[PDB]
Design a protein around this ligand. Structure first.
Ligand SMILES: *CCC(=O)Nc1ccc2[nH]c(=O)n(C3CCN(Cc4ccc(-c5nc6cc[nH]c(=O)c6cc5-c5ccccc5)cc4)CC3)c2c1
Length: 366
């Protein structure tokens, strides 16, 4: 019993590519907004509680859909030729979101250092004075508008007169990218450990939160004191190496995006090098799409078959792209002999203990 409010052609600026491309967009009553390469539901495509901008720069008659998703502000910009069509779309979208909607101080946190800076806000490392704990704080411009073992938990959320703050857990066992850099390669077991905890997390986001992480890379993986994995959520509205082929063409991305990303991350750990690397970005784009995956000829076939299935070009042919989603990967030979309920319960003994005295140890901040 879901109806379409409006439907038509629009010029969409690529979310990852700076050029304009024509896509066929559909606006359903539930608040879904999906574009297609040609005329033929993850919460990523939701237009629920989004802002609508009307700009004339660079291209005239351009409108932007500013959305706050969890703790990250996203922008979706579109172009139409006639100024009246922009009015027909904006009034339609707004009425949908409107109809869809109807149906602690900062004084406890010492500013330690700046972690990042974006268009609508910053990320700062802070210390909770009362407990001496270390958290990351997303502060976002107010004008813009439950917990998993391996996700950086959102602990607090409060407002000021002009900005909106999100206090999130900050792992103190260092970043996984640097850890890989010291060892320069990871054992199959260690990579299996790390991959497993991610699979559990991706399953959570997909099956329960109904969302795609969409930016799974080495730079977003950290370790807690014990050695378990924390997937970070520190993105602001500011890398072509990790991009999926489906995201490249800007057509119908889905849960498979996270599975492509997983393959790339697990490749770097067991191979020690990026699967598709080139200084030239344009050659790297042709590399991802056209070139066939290569291997060091020193890996167990299980891992080789896992990465092969994860780094296939077609999202539906790609491992975990089907309806079963994560379970396709959980049943894999490389993940045979692993009890997954124990993975979620942190029952898995970490192959690496970060050199940390306690939760509050500040060694890995150098
Ligand atoms: C200015 C730059 C810009 O606009 N970039 C941009 C453009 C378009 C984008 N579309 C996108 O999808 N993104 C992504 C936004 C999300 N982000 C990663 C990410 C994914 C999921 C979560 C998350 N979401 C929820 C939702 C509901 N309940 C939850 O408990 C959630 C938890 C999480 C979560 C996941 C991991 C760790 C902690 C919490 C958060 C972030 C990638 C880009 C665009 C970006």
């Amino acid at each position: 019993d879901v109806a379409i409010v409006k439907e038509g052609w629009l010029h969409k600026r690529g979310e990852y590519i700076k050029t304009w491309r024509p896509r066929y967009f559909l606006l359903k009553n539930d608040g879904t907004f999906i574009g297609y390469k040609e005329r033929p539901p993850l919460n990523n495509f939701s237009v629920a509680q989004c802002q609508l901008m009307k700009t004339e720069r660079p291209r005239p008659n351009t409108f932007i859909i500013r959305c706050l998703q969890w703790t990250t502000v996203i922008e979706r910009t579109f172009h139409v030729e006639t100024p009246e069509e922009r009015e027909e779309w904006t009034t339609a979208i707004q009425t949908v979101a409107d109809g869809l909607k109807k149906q602690v101080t900062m004084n406890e946190f010492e500013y330690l250092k700046l972690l990042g800076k974006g268009t609508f806000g910053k990320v700062i490392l802070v210390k909770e004075k009362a407990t001496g704990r270390y958290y990351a704080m997303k502060i976002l411009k107010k004008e813009v508008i439950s917990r998993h073992p391996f996700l950086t938990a959102l602990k607090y959320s409060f407002q000021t007169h002009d900005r909106l703050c999100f206090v999130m857990e900050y792992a103190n066992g260092g970043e996984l990218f640097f850890h890989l850099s010291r060892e320069r390669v990871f054992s199959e077991d260690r990579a299996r450990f790390y991959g497993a905890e991610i699979v559990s997390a991706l399953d959570y986001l997909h099956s329960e939160k109904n969302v795609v992480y969409r930016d799974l890379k080495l730079e977003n993986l950290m370790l807690d004191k014990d050695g378990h994995i924390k997937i970070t959520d520190f993105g602001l509205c500011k890398t072509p190496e990790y991009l999926a082929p489906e995201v490249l063409e800007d057509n119908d991305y889905g849960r498979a995006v996270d599975w492509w990303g997983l393959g790339v991350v697990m490749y770097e750990m067991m191979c020690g090098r990026l699967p598709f690397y080139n200084q030239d970005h344009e050659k790297l784009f042709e590399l991802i799409l056209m070139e066939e995956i290569r291997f060091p000829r020193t890996l167990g076939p299980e891992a080789k078959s896992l990465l092969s299935g994860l780094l296939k070009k077609d999202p539906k042919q790609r491992l975990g792209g089907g309806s079963e989603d994560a379970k396709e990967i959980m049943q894999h030979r490389f993940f045979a002999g692993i009890v997954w309920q124990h993975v979620y319960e942190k029952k898995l003994s970490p192959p690496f203990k970060p050199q940390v005295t306690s939760e509050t140890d500040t060694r890995y901040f150098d």
